[model samples]
Target: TCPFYKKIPGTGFTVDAFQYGVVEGCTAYFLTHFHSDHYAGLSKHFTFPVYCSEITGNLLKNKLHVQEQYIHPLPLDTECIVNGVKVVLLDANHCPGAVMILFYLPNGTVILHTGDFRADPSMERSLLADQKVHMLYLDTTYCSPEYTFPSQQEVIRFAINTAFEAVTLNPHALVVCGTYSIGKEKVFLAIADVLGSKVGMSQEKYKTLQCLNIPEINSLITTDMCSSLVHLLPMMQINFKGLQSHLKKCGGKYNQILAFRPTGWTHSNKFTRIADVIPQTKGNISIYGIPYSEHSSYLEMKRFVQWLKPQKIIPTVNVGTWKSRSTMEKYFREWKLEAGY
Candidate 1:
C-alpha cells in the first residue's frame, strides 16, 4: 500500500530505501543533495547514515523536517566515512545545500553519484571528469546540449544585487525576483549580508541565520506587504491575470515589477509561455531576464562527464530515461561515445 509504489511502474515490495529491492545491507545509501527527486523516497521508509553538508543537514532538519540525528554532514569539500566507505562531499552548487558525492568502496571501485547537478564549475571540476570515477549515478536532466544555463552564484549575485541597487536608489522601486520557498532563499539572505539590510530574506532564512546563530544580513519586505519595500510572490500567481490584476488593484502602483525565472525556465511548457500570462501590460513595468536554472545544460552535462570521468554513468528521469534518455543517446552517438542505462 505504498503511494510511491503506486507511482512506480512495477508492483514490488516497498523497502526503507526509495529503491524497490530488499536491502542486502550494502555499504551505504548516500544522499547527494536536498532536491525532492533524489531525497523524496528515503524519508518515507528508511533511515540510514544520511550524508550531506551542514547546510543540507540544516535544510533536512529545518525545512524538509527530517530527523537531524540520522544525518552525517560533511562540510563542502570535506571527507567522511560511512561503514568503511570513503565518502567525499563536494558542493553541487545547484541549489542551497546541494552536493555531488564521491564514493571509494572497499573493492577498489570508485563511484561518483550526482543526485542532481548543474554546470557549477566547482562541482564539475571536483566530481565529473574524464574516466576519473569508476562509476557514476549521473543526473541526465540536462543531457541535451540545448538544455542549460549560467552558474547559480552568477544569477544570484546579478539578480539580487541589481534589484537592491535599483530599488534602494529609486525608493519607490518594487523588486520582484524568484526563489524557492527554501534553500535558494539564501540568495536573498546573502544579498542582505552584502547590503547589511534587516535580514528580510524569509523566516526560514532568518531562522537558519539565527538557529545556526549566523548573522542578520539582507533585509527586504516579503511580497505580502506590497505597501512596504520589495515583495516576493509566486510566478504563477503573478502570471495569472486575475491575481495580478487583484494585486495591482490593492496598492501595486508604486512598485517596479520583476519576475524570477530559473536559467532552465523555458517554453518547455510549450502551451504556456510568459507572453501568454504577463502579455503586454501597458503600464510602468520592466522585465529583467535573469538566467537561473536548477538543472544543468547541454554543455554543462558534457563538461560534467568530462570532469567526473566516471567508468559508468547512469542518468536519471529525464536524461536517457523514457523522456530524456533518447536525447542523451543522441549525444552519445554524435560524439562516438557510450552511455550507461
Candidate 2:
C-alpha cells in the first residue's frame, strides 16, 4: 500500500486518495463513500473513470456535480472485470452508499479495502469467507483499545429512550438532532418515529437525503420549521449557543431545547454502560453526546482482522504521524499473532 496515496500494491486502482490529485500509473479511481474526507480532492473538474456503489454514484452526480459519463455505478456483491482485475463491492455498514471494496489481482492476490467501515456479523458470511485475503487496507479510525463504544443499535435504543423521557418530562421541549451529510440517520429517524414528530431540515439536506432513497423520508421531513418539533442540524450546530440561537429563531414556540450530538468520540473505556455517559447542560439547553459511531470499534476491528487473517494489514487513517501508525501497527501485530497467522 502507498503510505500517503492508498493505492493497492499491484493494481492500477486507487481507493479514496483523490486529495493527492490524479495518481500516476493509476488507470481507475474507486471511491468507498461520499464523506468529505474520502472524496476531499474530487471535484467537477476531475476527468477519470470513477467506480463506486450506485448510491455513491448518485451522490457524486447530485452533490459534487461530477459528470455522469465519468461515474460508473457497480452493483453490490457482483463480480466485474475492471482493468484486468476482478472487483466486488460489499456493504460497509458505515453509512449510506459506503462499501468495502474487494479486488482480485492477476497474481492470485486478494485485497479488501475497508473504506471507513463498521464491522457487523453478516459480513462473516460474505464471499470473502471462501478466499484467502492477502492484503487488507483497513479503516483504523478507532484502532486503539480506549476508543471502544456501544453498538449502533444499542446507541440508537439509548437515544430513543432518553429522548422519550426528556419529552415526557417537558412535552413542549424542542428536539434537535445533530448529523453529518450522511451519517447518524438512524438515531434521528428512530427519535422521530417514537415521538411521532416530523423532521425539519434545510433544503440542501433534504436534497442530499433524497439521494439516499430512504423509505418514507419524503413524508417524514418538513421544510416548515414550526410544523415539526424535531429538527436536524449539522453536527457543528449542536452546541449550547447554537441550540440557543436556534431556539430563539423559533420565536418561543418551544420553551426548552434538547439536543442529541451523536458521535463515537464521546465513548471511552471509562464508561461501561451507555446510560452512564453524561450530557452537557447550560440553562434551558441540554446537549447529549451519544456514543453513536459509523466506524468500527476496536473490538470489532480486532474480530474482523482475526477472522480474515490477512497476510498483511495496512492502516488507512491516523497514519500522518509515525507514532500513531506504529501504535495501530502494534494492535495489528497482536491480532494477527492471536489468530496464529
Candidate 3:
C-alpha cells in the first residue's frame, strides 16, 4: 500500500490520502493534487471538506462533479489557520493546481510536504527555497540516479522541433502526438502553435482540455480527421496495439505514421538507463521518446534536500522497506554529507 497520509506526531491532525471516514479524530485533510493514485477512493459519496489549491478544487468539482462544500480551495502563497496551526500552500509546478504544503506548528517547527513536485533548485523566486524544514515528505517517483532528464521546457522544444522535422521529412505521414489527459497540454498546444494548424483529439480529450479554459489550446481542436494536421492521442493510446487499431480504423489513407511520446519513462532502458532522447524508426512507422518529466530526478532531489536541510526525510513511495525512517536516512546519506553554499 502507498504511504499517503502524514500524521503529526501526538496530534489528531492528518494531512491527505487517509480516508476521513476510516480514521478517527481527524481534524483536517490536505490534498496535494487530484492525481488518481494520490486521491484514490475519493468519490461523490465523500462528505468531509478537504484542502487543496483553487485549480485542483475546480477540477474536482468540474470533472468529477464533486459537491461544492466538500472542497476548501487554498490560495497560492497565502497562509490559513487549520486546527490552530498556520498552513501555507506553495506551487508544486508538477501539474495544474499541484501544491507543496507547509504547516507551521505551535512550537514554530515547520513540516513541508512536497506533493509530486518538479523541484528546480535554481528557482530563486520560489518561497520554499532556503526555508527551514523540520520534516520533508518527498515525492520520489523518479528518485533514482538513472533518471537524468532535461528541463520540461527543453524537452517540449525538442518534441516540437522533432515533430516539425518528422512531418517535413514525411509529408504523407500522419503525426500522432502522445500525452496524458491533464498534465501535458503544453506539449500538444506547443505543437499546434508551431505548426499553425488544428490538432485532432477524441471528444473526451477535447472536453478535458476545454475545462482548463485555455483558449489558445481549446481553439486548436479539430474533430475532422481529414482536416486535422496532427493527432493528439492519449498516453495509453501511444502503444503498439492502440496505434495499430487507430491506424487500421482511421489511418488507412496515410502511407506512414509518426508517433511521438513525451515522457520521463523513456529514459529507462530495462536494466541500465540513458540520458539522451531515443528515436526509433522502421519502415512506415517512426517513434520518438522525449524526456518531459513532471517529477524531480535523483540529482534534483539531492539539490532540494541540500537546500532545505530537513531533519527527517520521509519518502512517499515504498522502496523495498515500506515504513522505515532509516531507509530515508540511508537514501539521503550521500546527499546529507555534501557541502552546501
TM-score of each model, in listed order: 0.70, 0.95, 0.86
Candidate 3 runs further than 4 Å off: 1-5, 10-12, 18-20, 122-124, 129-131, 213-215, 222-226, 251-253, 266-278, 319-328
Higher-scoring candidate on lDDT, 2 or 3: 2
Give the alpha-carbon lDDT of every model.
0.52, 0.86, 0.73
- Candidate 2: list runs displaced more than 4 Å: 1-5, 267-269
For model 3, how does the per-residue alpha-carbon lDDT over 25-57 read when each residue is reduced to its tens digit? 665667788777777667777777778888788
> Please, what are the lDDT tens digits per residue for candidate 1 over residues 1-341?
32331121121211124443334443344555655655656552356556566776776677656676677677766567666556676666566566766666676767665656665566544533433566666666656555545556666767666667666777655544444443455544555444444322345444544333233322333333533444444454444353355347547465545444443556543344322333234354554444456666777777656655555556554532354666666665554354332
Ranking of models by lDDT: 2, 3, 1
Error of 2 at 19 (Å): 2.1
Off by over 4 Å in 1: 1-28, 42-47, 120-131, 148-170, 181-228, 240-256, 267-289, 319-323, 336-341
Q: What is the per-residue lDDT of model 2 for residues 188-305, given as tens digits with 9 covering 90 to 100?
A: 8899888998898998988898899688777788788888888999889889878889988999788898899876765353565886766788999888878788988888888888
Q: Alpha-carbon error at 299 in model 2, in Å?
A: 1.1
Model 3 quality (TM-score): 0.86
Model 3 lDDT on a 0 to 1 scale: 0.73
